[PDB]
């Protein structure tokens, strides 16, 4: 019933998405119905055949039975995938958990994309720090007044949270729930596509990016842009035959988007315009 801008370019003052209990009045959670982009059906067909998948829909249904306010709303749950078919992904930026907060009016900040928030919401501090980094390395001259990343995602920036849901006003309460789904999503992308760019901000995203073959794909690692880590180095477990903690630079010292640009250009791929 909608076109893509209606899902990805969201206005908090004109927010008509149904909540979970409205889409599933009888708690009959059906994640497949939340995926509007046909190029993902093959991946989804692989995921429903796994034994964890009924467990996932069971846990979500149980949260609805207890009347928990799951965010983001289900028409936004798979937002980044509904914008981007897998064959059009150029950069994967992992978040951890969705924003738990909301506007005065009850519009959630979570919109099914990592780091992004609807128009006419406050810019979260992590995202402000990302903008600061873009300004510092000459990719942008002034911070946008909003926090809506529709522009980057439409151009192939696959910005998802490894935990696709949380509960309104509670941080990270569904961290185990999505781990197998997200692992299969990462594995699907790295098995079927080549020379993606993975951006690992923080130790959790870095663990996830060590599922990825670093000779087949390009992995960029630093600390997280949140104010608690933006200007400090990060220590993160480097897995393998001889596991050891390694130190990675602070977020605000790395030219993340310059590095994305140079890698895309070195493979003759179309660039991403960060400012527009």
Residue numbers in the entry: 95 to 370
Please share text taken word for word from the publication where this structure appeared.
In the BER pathway, uracil-DNA glycosylase (UDG) recognizes uracil which exists in DNA and creates an abasic site by cleaving the N-glycosidic bond between uracil and deoxyribose. Interestingly, APMV UNG (mvUNG) is longer than other known UNGs, suggesting that it contains domains or motifs in addition to the canonical catalytic domain. mvUNG (residues 1–370) contains a catalytic domain conserved among UNG family proteins. Additionally, it has an N-terminal domain (N-domain; residues 1–130) and an insertional motif (motif-I; residues 327–343).
Needle-shaped crystals were grown from full-length mvUNG, and the diffraction data were collected up to 2.3 Å resolution. Residues 95–370 of two mvUNG proteins in the asymmetric unit were traced into the electron density, and the final model was refined with R/Rfree values of 17.3/21.6%. Thus, the N-terminal residues seem to be truncated before crystallization. Two mvUNGs in the asymmetric unit were superimposed with a root-mean-square deviation (RMSD) of 0.4 Å for 276 Cα atoms, indicating that the two mvUNGs are in the same conformation. The catalytic domain of mvUNG also forms a similar fold, comprising a central β-sheet (S2, S3, S5) sandwiched by α-helices (H5–H12). In the structure of mvUNG, residues 95–130 comprise four short helices, two α-helices (H1 and H3), and two 310-helices (H2 and H4). Residue R96 in the N-domain forms an ionic interaction with E169 in the catalytic domain, and the segment is fitted into a hydrophobic groove of the catalytic domain. Residues 95–130 of the N-domain seem to stabilize the catalytic core domain by binding to its hydrophobic surface. Motif-I forms a two-stranded antiparallel β-sheet (S7 and S8) and provides a positively charged surface near the active site, which might improve the interaction with the DNA backbone. The catalytic residue (D191) and the other four residues for uracil-binding specificity in the binding pocket (Y193, F209, N255, and H318) are conserved as the canonical active site residues, whereas Leu in the minor groove intercalation loop is replaced by Y322 in mvUNG.
